[PDB]
Design a protein around this ligand. Structure first.
Ligand code: NA
Ligand code: ZN
Ligand code: ZN
Lengths: 88, 92
């Protein structure tokens, strides 16, 4: 795998680390997802100064989740990560 | 940074290693994005169907290859690649 592809695989690996733990191996409960995000994106979250974006990440977690839904969250975290790399 | 965060930063880093090279420092042409797709995703995006998803997003990645693509658009490609990377783990 390329460097880019190692990153994609690693993201998939982290998902699976959480998703394997209970029930079906490829999905996670909203509760488990909330825990994954709060731990694995702790620094990302701390650096987001727009509370509406944080709201975007956690939205609906109190209302199973699959990899496709997890991608949508990864996409948000990626936008945030890029913006932060340009912090003066 | 967590391992997940290092991978996010790594993805941003790879975009920037391409974007910084010519033109505007934070974008790349559609031509350059094709080069990134062909090289960096050689083991991930491999068939007509996955290239079709990408073409839909970029209005045909081969057309208007001077057009600039920003990080937000590149995210749409990373999302397609992640889906393929995941599907791959369940092939065997
Ligand atoms: Na599970
Ligand atoms: Zn899976
Ligand atoms: Zn940038």
């Amino acid at each position: 795998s390329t460097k880019l592809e190692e990153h994609l695989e690693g993201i998939v690996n982290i998902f699976h680390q959480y998703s394997v733990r209970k029930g079906h191996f490829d999905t996670l409960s909203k509760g488990e997802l909330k825990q994954l995000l709060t731990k694995e994106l702790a620094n990302t979250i701390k650096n987001i100064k727009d509370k509406a974006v944080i709201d975007e990440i956690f939205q609906g977690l109190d209302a199973q989740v699959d990899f496709q839904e997890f991608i949508s969250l990864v996409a948000i975290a990626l936008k945030a990560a890029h913006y932060h790399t340009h912090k003066e």
